[PDB]
Every structure is written in structure tokens, then in C-alpha cells.
């Protein structure tokens, strides 16, 4: 029966596969270290400075 609610998330950086990995800094979900160690889509600006 319908008990599942899709208890998973997609990579918010490439939107390719599931975001199995998570960034404890911003709260983003990435599919792997590929999108983790990115500085184009994986933005760590936080504030202006
Ligand atoms: Zn981050
Ligand atoms: Zn990704």
C-alpha cells in the first residue's frame, strides 16, 4: 500500500541523482564529492562578507 513518501532527496547541485551526501555548512544535498567540492553551483557565500 501507499506508505512511502519518497524519503530521499536529489542532488540540488546537478539535479542528476539522489543527494546521498550532505553539506553541514549550508545544508545542501549533493550526489557525491563531485558536486561537494564545487565552487560554481555549490555556493558558500552565506552573507555578503
Ligand atoms: Zn555547502
Ligand atoms: Zn550532483
Curated annotation (Swiss-Prot):
Give the range the annotation lists for the signal sequence.
Answer: none
Q: Which domain of life is it from?
A: Eukaryota
- Residues that, per the record, bind Zn(2+): 11, 14, 31, 35
Which sequence ranges does the entry mark as zinc finger (HIT-type)? 11-49
Extra facts: Present with 2730 molecules/cell in log phase SD medium.
Name the record gives this protein: Protein HIT1
Primary gene name: HIT1
| Parent-protein start and end of this portion | 1 to 46 of 164
